[PDB]
Amino acid sequence: PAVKRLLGWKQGDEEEKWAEKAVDALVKKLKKKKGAMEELEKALSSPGQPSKCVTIPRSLDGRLQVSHRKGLPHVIYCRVWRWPDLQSHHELKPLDICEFPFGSKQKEVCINPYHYKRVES
Amino acid sequence: SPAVKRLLGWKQGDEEEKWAEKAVDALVKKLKKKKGAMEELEKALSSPGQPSKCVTIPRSLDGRLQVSHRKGLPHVIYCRVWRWPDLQSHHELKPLDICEFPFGSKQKEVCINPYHYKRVES
Amino acid sequence: PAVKRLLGWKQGDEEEKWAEKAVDALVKKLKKKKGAMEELEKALSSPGQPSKCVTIPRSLDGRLQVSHRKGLPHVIYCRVWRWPDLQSHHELKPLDICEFPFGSKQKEVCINPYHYKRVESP
Amino acid sequence: PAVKRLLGWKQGDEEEKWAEKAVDALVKKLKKKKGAMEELEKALSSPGQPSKCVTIPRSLDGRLQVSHRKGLPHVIYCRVWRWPDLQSHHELKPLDICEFPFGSKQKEVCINPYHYKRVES
DNA sequence: ATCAGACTGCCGGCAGTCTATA
DNA sequence: TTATAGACTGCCGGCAGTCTGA
DNA sequence: ATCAGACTGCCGGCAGTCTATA
DNA sequence: TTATAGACTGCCGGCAGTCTGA
Ligand SMILES: [Zn+2]
Ligand SMILES: [Zn+2]
Ligand SMILES: [Zn+2]
Ligand SMILES: [Zn+2]
Structure with a gap:
């Protein structure tokens, strides 16, 4: 409504800036991977309908660095798109469907937030 | 970039951001009940350089505002929203000599202009 | 043993200085009350046999002060002689046995260890 | 004073129990090393008169395990005998006198508290 | 369904009164 | 008995969260 | 100018070896 | 002389941030 005009002026916290x-x-x-973008948007678009793994190369430690701070990618993107408060990789368990889950220690890793489930430690 | 906007449309917001709204x-x-205040507030956020007049809301006896079960100080809140998200005390805010109704005054109404206040270490 | 000699040289943490x-x-x-130390020392000496109340004037506020640090008298001494880690009075249960417990609002308080019991806080 | 009799019945916190x-x-x-015990008592007994190094064997990590708690020896004993709030080895600098300070990485290490001085940072 | 005004709880600091001690 | 030093009760402040009634 | 792969630091637990003491 | 009790070194894990080099 009118509030929409004002929230344009709201400044963003450090995290959201980082999340962006x-x-x-x-x-x-x-973008280098072909078709991956659409599957993620479809994955994010619909919760119910399964989606194929969306993958990125997996580091030796598995930590991704973005804007000077390291993290684990599935943690990062599950936090971005599903649970913002998600505290650690311990809270995430992979799904049976996921071809390239985090534990597998394979060459690429699936960062699709809907291939994971949140659990209490 | 636009595709990034398409994806970030799907981003979740932290409890606080949900609260700020x-x-x-x-x-x-x-x-909205006062009619001349609304445009000026937008103009103050719209215009950084030119000063704009006090925008007022009633002051409770203790001075706390309640939004969605959590109380706060009205001036720190909207300053937190529009200028400094990192703000955490009213001690970090010092009103300006311009403000007819600052938080310290203990008057009937309070000015919610984020730009009538100044940020200081303390 | 010889360790006794070395531990004489040991330094004490700020709290233990405060405890003293x-x-x-x-x-x-x-000391103003006569013999109260003996009932207290005997109570501390023997856990089993119950012992008479040892009382101190109860402030309006209920807080005792020792060297700029306020506290609740029954907590302070239970912390000295029984539980060093006692965090707050909620952890203490007075006894049906005790004539004078902190919850009592008379103008005196009984600070007897072994007259209270430790319980899990809410 | 008279309190000394009762204060014997004060219970001791987890740290003091560990300190002992x-x-x-x-x-x-x-005790296996001969004369070290006397020198340490002399070291502690007299703060002004200097005393020779008091030594114990130095591990590969330099950490000493006591009653399930690992620590660094010169830190422990300075904490016991000199500064109880001493937080870390950073706060400690050896004296020009000490023959086997912690930095020396020698076969044995000197744990005499008075061979060290406390420093800011 | 939600907020304003009340309350109590908790925690410090402070000043006038209080206790040693020479 | 007297003067000067450190004590603490009591009072005050801020802070923050709960609850009934508007 | 920024990220991957390394390193060290810090901190625990763990297991095999050591030491009393019966 | 032997076995069983408790001890600790050394090694190991995860964790986290730095730095050089691709
Ligand atoms: Zn997947
Ligand atoms: Zn103003
Ligand atoms: Zn009692
Ligand atoms: Zn030395």
Whole structure:
């Protein structure tokens, strides 16, 4: 409503600024992969309908660096698109469907937030 | 870039950001009743350089505002929303000599202009 | 053994220095009452046999002060002689046995260890 | 004063109980070396007159394990005998006198508190 | 369904009164 | 008995969260 | 100018070896 | 002489931030 005009002026916290930076890094990695962008948007678009793994190269430690701060990608993007407060990779368990989950220690890793489930420690 | 906007449309907001919207909604409802205040507030945020007049809302006896079950100080809130998200005390804010109704005054009404206040370490 | 010699050289943490000062304060108010130390020392000496109330004037505020640090008298001494880690009075249960417990609002308080029991806080 | 009789019945917190446990390990450990015990008592007894290094064998990590708690020896004993609030080895600098300070990385290390000085930062 | 005004709780600092001690 | 030093009760402040009634 | 792969620091737990003491 | 009790070194893990180099 009228509030929409005002919230344009709301400034963003440091995290959201970072989150935006983290997403840009993702699209840069995902553009080289063909079709991956649409599957993620479809994955994000609809919760119910399964989606194919969306993958990125997996580091030796598995930590991604974005804008000077390291993190684990599935943690980062699940926090971005599903649970903002998600505290650690311990809170995430992979799904049976996921071809390239985090534990697998394979070459690429699936960062689709809907391939994971949140659990209490 | 636009595709990033398409994806970031799907981003979730932290409890606070969800709250900031609720606080802004509460103010506009309270602020809509006075008719000349609404445009000036937008003009003050719209214009950084030119000063703009006090925008007022009633001061409770203790001075706390309640939005969605959590109380706050009205001036720190909207300063937190529109200027400094990192703001955490009213001790960090010093009113300006311009403000007819600052928080310290203990008057009937309070000025919610984020730009009538100044940020200081303390 | 020889360790006794070395531990004489050991330094004490700020709290243990505070504990000594608080105990010094207790006997000073306690010395005015005759024999109270003996019932207290016997109570501390033997856990099993119950012992008479040892009381101190109860402030309006209920807070005792020793050297700029306020506290609740029954908590302070239960912390000295029974539980060093006692965090707050909620953790303490008075006894049906005790004639004078902190919850009592008379103008005196019984600070007897072994007259209270430790319970899990809410 | 008269309080000394009752204050014996004061209970001791977890740290002090450990401190005694730490001191006991030292002497038992420090008894095989001859004369060290006297020098340490002399070291502690007299603050102004200097005393020779008091030594114990130095591990690969430099950490000493006592009663399930790992620590650095010169830190422990300075904390016991000199500054109880001493937080870390950073706060400690050796004296020009000390023959086997912590930095030396020698076969044995000097745990005499008075061979060290406390420093800001 | 939600907020304003009340309350109590908790926690400090402070000043006038209080206690040693020479 | 007297003067000067440090004590603490009591009072005050801020802070923050709960609850009934508007 | 920014990120991957390294390193060290810090801090715990763990297991095999050591030491009393019966 | 032997076995069983408790001890600790050394090693190991995860964690986190720095730095050089691609
Ligand atoms: Zn997947
Ligand atoms: Zn103003
Ligand atoms: Zn009692
Ligand atoms: Zn030395």
